[PDB]
Design brief:
This is Bifunctional cytochrome P450/NADPH--P450 reductase. About 50% of the residues lie in helices and about 10% in strands. It has about 450 residues and is an alpha+beta fold. Bound molecules: protoporphyrin IX containing FE and the ligand O=C(CCCCn1ccnc1)N[C@@H](Cc1ccccc1)C(=O)O. The site of ligand IRV has 16 residues, from α1, α3, α7 and α10.
Length: about 450
């Protein structure tokens, strides 16, 4: 079968289709029009966007396909280096860092991070308790304050103190501006035009800021000798069982940069979309709030109580279904192979997995695919293989999944325990795209139930 291809622009092929404010949503509309697979070409590049569980279940076979760096991840590698997300599977530092960090990211490790997550969650709740009557909440903004502070504290015992400020931390200014340059660079029809020389000088300056600040975090910790129970201590002290080697300081810096990207708007986006869907679905909100009140019987949640917030967990999975905040990942064929009995691929051929569109496969989810129904996730065994991929696939899946879900379940549970929510503007969903997704301008009012944290 010859696969379809969206409209072309002469020698720029399909590249101008990406020169839009909302490229993921544009690719979703192309998939609506063209179906489960389409070819996408740009100067020097061919890939194939997959959208059906039928084809993606094959693409997730690690004997046939391995992780590819998309152009986006190749550009992120200019500042995240051979950290875990921007490493190829065959680089020594991927498997080394993977083996060392897996124990730091397990459910067991979450028991140790729990108290630091609570510290930040209580700050969020106190901020909202302290708002004046008729004041509102800027939801993505506050969710990013919470997720950034949580990965700073659990990551390297650093307080970004995001609830004390409006202006971002200098590291975050350079990180966000670096990610903006990545997005801009993907959209340039003529990337070598001297009109972008200033952008490139700024990008290099931002790389240096991130390196300098993280290198000093690492140097300061080695100099103090402090043994806090954070990711940095584990990286300084751990040895890979396979090679017997530790990570060196440059790779530790790249991992820290990698975690800060991941724990910033990628994770806060999940909380923002979850709260959006809850306020647009009042019966779902009521059920989740009933669970929070039943389970969260103490002034601060315990680790075991967060594990008991089963419906809150289903709410988060259903938000990941509709708007997964890391919306694509890339693969390449390890050898010649045929996809779906119809599409022959050659060794090295690239695939993109378009996750929001996979999650809209009606052959899997049924006709009500746009509805927000957390009960879809009552039983993971009832979900077909590779139908639900917000955290990627296989050995290259998200190492932070348990971390992101624990922090999100904890704070959403506390939010639902402590406040009633009003969609006071009847907010119209507007999804802003960076390399992640967020409901731009999403605001609510939160009326306290006046339940103390003491
Ligand atoms: C809801 C929040 C998150 C989502 C949806 C998410 C999604 C993903 C996805 C889709 C991938 C695979 C990317 C690819 O194949 O190119 C990935 C990888 C990864 N994520 Fe996350 N992520 C989240 C939060 C986090 C957090 C909080 C951390 C750590 C602080 C983290 C650390 C990583 C790492 C290190 C990898 C690379 C794993 C490897 O290849 O060995 N992620 N994430
Ligand atoms: O595949 C990725 C990268 C997703 C990586 C997730 N991530 C990692 C760190 N922060 C976020 N983008 C997509 C969509 C896209 C297209 C053009 C411009 C921007 C985005 C693509 O190129 O098709």
């Amino acid at each position: 079968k010859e696969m379809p291809q969206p409209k072309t622009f002469g020698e720029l092929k399909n590249l101008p289709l990406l020169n839009t404010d909302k490229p993921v949503q544009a690719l979703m509309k192309i998939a609506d029009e063209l179906g489960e697979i389409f070819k996408f070409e740009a100067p020097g590049r061919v890939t194939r966007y997959l959208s059906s569980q039928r084809l993606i279940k094959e693409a997730c076979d690690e004997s046939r396909f391995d992780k590819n760096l998309s152009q986006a991840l190749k550009f992120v590698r200019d500042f995240a280096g051979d950290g875990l997300v921007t490493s190829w599977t065959h680089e020594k530092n991927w498997k080394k860092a993977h083996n060392i960090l897996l124990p730091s990211f397990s459910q067991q490790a979450m028991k140790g991070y729990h108290a630091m997550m609570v510290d930040i969650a209580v700050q969020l709740v106190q901020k909202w308790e302290r708002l004046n009557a008729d004041e509102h909440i800027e939801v993505p903004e506050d969710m990013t304050r919470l997720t950034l502070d949580t990965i700073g504290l659990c990551g390297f015992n650093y307080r970004f103190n995001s609830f004390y400020r409006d202006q971002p931390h200098p590291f975050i200014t350079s990180m966000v501006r670096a990610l903006d340059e990545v997005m801009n660079k993907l959209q340039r029809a003529n990337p070598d035009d001297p009109a972008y020389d200033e952008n490139k000088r700024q990008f290099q300056e931002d790389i240096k800021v991130m390196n300098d600040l993280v290198d000093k975090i690492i140097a300061d910790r080695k100099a103090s000798g402090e043994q806090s129970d954070d990711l940095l201590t584990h990286m300084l002290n751990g040895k890979d069982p396979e090679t017997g080697e530790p990570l060196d300081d440059e790779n530790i810096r790249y991992q820290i940069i990698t975690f800060l990207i991941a724990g910033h708007e990628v994770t806060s986006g999940l909380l923002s979309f979850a709260l959006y869907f809850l306020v647009k679905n009042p019966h779902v909100l009521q059920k989740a709030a009933e669970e929070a009140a039943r389970v969260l019987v103490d002034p601060v949640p315990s680790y075991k109580q967060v594990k008991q917030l089963k419906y809150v967990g289903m709410v988060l999975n259903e938000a990941l279904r509709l708007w997964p905040t890391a919306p694509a990942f890339s693969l390449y064929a390890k050898e010649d192979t045929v996809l779906g009995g119809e599409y022959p691929l050659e060794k090295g051929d690239e695939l993109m997995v378009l996750i929001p569109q996979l999650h809209r496969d009606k052959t899997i989810w049924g006709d009500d695919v746009e509805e927000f129904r957390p009960e879809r996730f009552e039983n993971p065994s009832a979900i077909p293989q590779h139908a639900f991929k917000p955290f990627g696939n296989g050995q290259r899946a998200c190492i932070g999944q348990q971390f992101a879900l624990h922090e999100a379940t904890l704070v959403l549970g506390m939010m639902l325990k402590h406040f009633d929510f009003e969609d006071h503007t009847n907010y119209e969903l507007d999804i802003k795209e960076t390399l992640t997704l967020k409901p731009e301008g999403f605001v609510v009012k939160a009326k306290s139930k006046k339940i103390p944290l003491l």
